[PDB]
Structures are given as structure tokens and as C-alpha cells.
Design a binder for these strands. Structure first.
Ligand SMILES: Nc1ncnc2c1ncn2[C@H]1C[C@H](O)[C@@H](COP(=O)(O)OP(=O)(O)OP(=O)(O)O)O1
Ligand SMILES: [Ca+2]
Ligand code: NA
Length: 430
DNA sequence: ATTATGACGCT
DNA sequence: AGCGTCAT
């Protein structure tokens, strides 16, 4: 009853760029705009691997992970942009730099949590309170929400997409209590008005379009964001949760896409998020552990407490390369040359990072994969990172891995290595 | 022969 | 510390 928390204490948004690497390439090369197009890395092996796909190309069935030669079978006029290659490896600098452009804009509106190269969570609780004071009980016009969907509406007693959207928006606004400054639904709505403003500023200042979700926590905001992509934003209210979750496959909720979600399904014999409500908190803790159990019990009711962490910069800076099949590194000289290639890219990114962000990394993590292991990483060792110098870092990386060499011969490397990875971590202010 | 990242939980 | 999970 009156003591039952409803998880309506915050307004949180998740903003995610549409087909991000594709938009970066389309901005740069206008010939790619408004066309079926994809971004690919490498090219020699089956035309390159696809990492991003424009919405026009998705209509033909083109997807991430697909080889470009295969994508062309579905979409013969597919256009391609290639990721930059430097020092013999893919270099993602252009996209990291485009990401900073977007993140700096978002940061004008509120504190953000950088969730990936093209996604940030925003805690808007404070900004909403403020805007509510300016409004002074004044109603919110649909004109302030020109790209917003209200999940679950319209409902109750036109056949076009935009007409539906407006009908739902109208029902939502018609029902709002604008007189109550602490109404969660009102707070969400003001949140959405602010996100429209953030999304317009992003598009104006960078050319990039995005989608967004607005709800009371990160998981719902993330789920909401995906409901109406591209170039749209979706509000998911606390009230919309029972119907939304009633047919929502468990794997769709962030963190349940893998083995834990599979076990929730198998152990409990259910399919949808809403079905979770029938288990006690202790039942769920008994199957999935204390932390997961509590999290599930609240989450299936639309409640989650994970904070938007104040962090705009990545916590680690890493460089990795696979050496598949026949290309696996089998000689000491090969291993040393590639460690250097990786180490040079890392030095370049670290030096830039130190000048930009007033910090220095203090630990170097080195990770390899050996031919045969099903696991992505086979071994991980750390050493001190005391100077930003590529030759030193590559020398140290070798030292910590060289005893992995099974070969009795000095010059040979066995088993051959199928992945090398260098990562700078443990930053300190400077 | 997906590849290149990046955050966080467990012991 | 080193490994695993989950994500983009
Ligand atoms: N598995 C991956 N391997 C390499 N790069 C990836 C991978 N997944 C995503 N990326 C890169 C390319 C994407 O443009 C960018 C953002 O990813 P993501 O948000 O999942 O898709 P997207 O932005 O391309 O399309 P969407 O409009 O569906 O969000 O990160
Ligand atoms: Ca995206
Ligand atoms: Na994303």
C-alpha cells in the first residue's frame, strides 16, 4: 500500500545514435546519404566484415557480422565505407572522435554516463524539477514533443504511423495532471520535452540523428529507446509496465540476454518478463543468487536503482587484433612485431588522452588467445605502466607472455597465437 | 575467419 | 589478481 515503493523517484533517459558508424561515414561522404550502405572492416576476406548498417540496407536483410560478399547477394547496390587501417589493423579513431562530439553536447544538459561509443544515460531528475518551476502549472503542448511515442497508447474506444503516434500522445497529454509538481507521469513528460531539445541540439550541431528512451530507471529507458527507432524517442511510464512486460521476452531486458536469462527461462518455465511477478523475492534469490534475485524481483515490477554514474570518459584504453585460421602467429618475430604495432597505437591514444583529460594510466594488461581455445581470452597478465613509450610497452608485454611459448625452439611460437590485446588501465590524475 | 572494443561481477 | 559475463 502506502509504504510500497514504486521506483518513480528519478527521470532517466538513454540516448543512442542511429546506425552510428554509418552516419559518421555519411556525414563525411554525401554520396552515401539516404542509400543502403554499411561500414566494413578489412576487405580481403569475403569483402570485409560488416559492423554497421543503414536502415535502407536493413530492409534488404543486411545485418551486422555478415560478410560484405554475402550482403551484396541480398542488396546488390549496397554501398560500403571501410574502417581506417593503420599499422596493419583497424583503427576506430574517427568514431571515437565523433562520439566525443555527441557526448560533450549531452553534457550541457546534464551529467551523463558513457555507456558505449554511441550511448549515454542521463539523470534528468534535477533538470525536470527546474523546468517545472518555469512552467508554473502551464500545460504541455504536443508541439513540444514532435517525435515522441507514449508506449501503450493509443488504446480504448487512421491507418498511418504518424497518426497513431499523435493519437497516443494526445490521449497521454489529455490525462496529465499538470497541477501536481510531484506527479511521476508529469515528470517523465517534462523529461521528454528536454530530450527533444537535447536530440535537436545533437542533430543541429553534428548532423547525427538518434533515438532515446525516457523512463524512471536505466533498464526501462534502454528498453524504451529501442521501441521506436530510428530518429524517434519513446516514453515508458511506470503504468505501462504490466502490459509491456506481459509479452516481453526475458532476453530483451539488459543483462538477461545471455546465460542468466536462459536459466531464468529454463528453471522457472516462463517466457516473458511479467511472468516473474509470481515468484517471491526469496524464491528468485534461491535460484539466481541474492543480488540477481532482488534485482529480478524489483525489475519485473518496473523498479531498478542502478544510478546514472557521473562518467563521461572511458576507464580503459585498449588495442586488440585477431589472427584467425592460417594467419595465427607462429614465430617469435611475428609476435614481437604485432605487439609493437598494437603498442604504437596505444601510445598514440594514451598521449592524446593525457593532454586532453589530465590523467595517466598506471597499469598495462596483456591478453592472448592460443589456437584451440574456445574461450575469447586464454591468458591475462598485468605489469606496471610507468612510461608512455611503445617499445617499452611492447617489450614488457612480451616479457609477461613469453613463457606461454610451448615450443622448445627459441625462434618458434607454439601454439600459435590467434589474438593479442594490450590495455591501459588504473588512471590517476595528472 | 567476426572483429574491436569496453564495463563490471566473482573468487 | 585473473577469469567470466554481457554489452555495443
Ligand atoms: N559487435 C560489434 N563489433 C564491432 N563494432 C560494433 C559492434 N556492435 C556495435 N558496433 C559499433 C558499430 C555501431 O555503429 C556502433 C553502435 O552500435 P549499436 O548501437 O549496437 O548499433 P548502431 O548504432 O549501428 O545501430 P542502431 O541504430 O540499431 O543503434 O558500435
Ligand atoms: Ca546506436
Ligand atoms: Na549504442
Amino acid at each position: 500500500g502506502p509504504h510500497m515503493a514504486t521506483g518513480q523517484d528519478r527521470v532517466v533517459a538513454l540516448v543512442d545514435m542511429d546506425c552510428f558508424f554509418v552516419q559518421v561515414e555519411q556525414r563525411q561522404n554525401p554520396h552515401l546519404r539516404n542509400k543502403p550502405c554499411a561500414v566494413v572492416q578489412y576487405k580481403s576476406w569475403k569483402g570485409g566484415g560488416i559492423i554497421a548498417v543503414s536502415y535502407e540496407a536493413r530492409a534488404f536483410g543486411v545485418t551486422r557480422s555478415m560478410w560484405a560478399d554475402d550482403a551484396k547477394k541480398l542488396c546488390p547496390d549496397l554501398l560500403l565505407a571501410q574502417v581506417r587501417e593503420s599499422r596493419g589493423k583497424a583503427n576506430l579513431t574517427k568514431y571515437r572522435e565523433a562520439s566525443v562530439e555527441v557526448m560533450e553536447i549531452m553534457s550541457r544538459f546534464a551529467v551523463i554516463e558513457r555507456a558505449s561509443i554511441d550511448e549515454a544515460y542521463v539523470d534528468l531528475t534535477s533538470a525536470v524539477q527546474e523546468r517545472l518551476q518555469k512552467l508554473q502549472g502551464q500545460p504541455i503542448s504536443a508541439d513540444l514533443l514532435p517525435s515522441t511515442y507514449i508506449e501503450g497508447l493509443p488504446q480504448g474506444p487512421t491507418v498511418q504511423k504518424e497518426g497513431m503516434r499523435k493519437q497516443g500522445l494526445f490521449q497521454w497529454l489529455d490525462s496529465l495532471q499538470i497541477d501536481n509538481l510531484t506527479s511521476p507521469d508529469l515528470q517523465l513528460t517534462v523529461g521528454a520535452v528536454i530530450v527533444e531539445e537535447m536530440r535537436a541540439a545533437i542533430e543541429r550541431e553534428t548532423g547525427f540523428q538518434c533515438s532515446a528512451g525516457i523512463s524512471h530507471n536505466k533498464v526501462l529507458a534502454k528498453l524504451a529507446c529501442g521501441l521506436n527507432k530510428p530518429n524517434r524517442q519513446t516514453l515508458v511510464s511506470h503504468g505501462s509496465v504490466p502490459q509491456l512486460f506481459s509479452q516481453m521476452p526475458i532476453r530483451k531486458i539488459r543483462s538477461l540476454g545471455g546465460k542468466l536469462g536462459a536459466s531464468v527461462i529454463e528453471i522457472l518455465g516462463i517466457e516473458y518478463m511479467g511472468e516473474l511477478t509470481q515468484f517471491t523475492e526469496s524464491q528468485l534469490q534461491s535460484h539466481f543468487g541474492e543480488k540477481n534475485g532482488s534485482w529480478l524481483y524489483a525489475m519485473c515490477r518496473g523498479i531498478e536503482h542502478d544510478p546514472v554514474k557521473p562518467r563521461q570518459l572511458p576507464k580503459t584504453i585498449g588495442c586488440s587484433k585477431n589472427f584467425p585460421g592460417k594467419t595465427a602467429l607462429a614465430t617469435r618475430e611475428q609476435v614481437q612485431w604485432w605487439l609493437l604495432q598494437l603498442a604504437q597505437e596505444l601510445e598514440e591514444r594514451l598521449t592524446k588522452d593525457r593532454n586532453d583529460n589530465d590523467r595517466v594510466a598506471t597499469q598495462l594488461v596483456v591478453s592472448i588467445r592460443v589456437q584451440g581455445d574456445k574461450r575469447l581470452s586464454s591468458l591475462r597478465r598485468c605489469c606496471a605502466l610507468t612510461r608512455y613509450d611503445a617499445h617499452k610497452m611492447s617489450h614488457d608485454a612480451f616479457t609477461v607472455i613469453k613463457n606461454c611459448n610451448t615450443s622448445g625452439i627459441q625462434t618458434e611460437w607454439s601454439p600459435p597465437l590467434t589474438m593479442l590485446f594490450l590495455c591501459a588501465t588504473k588512471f590517476s590524475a595528472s
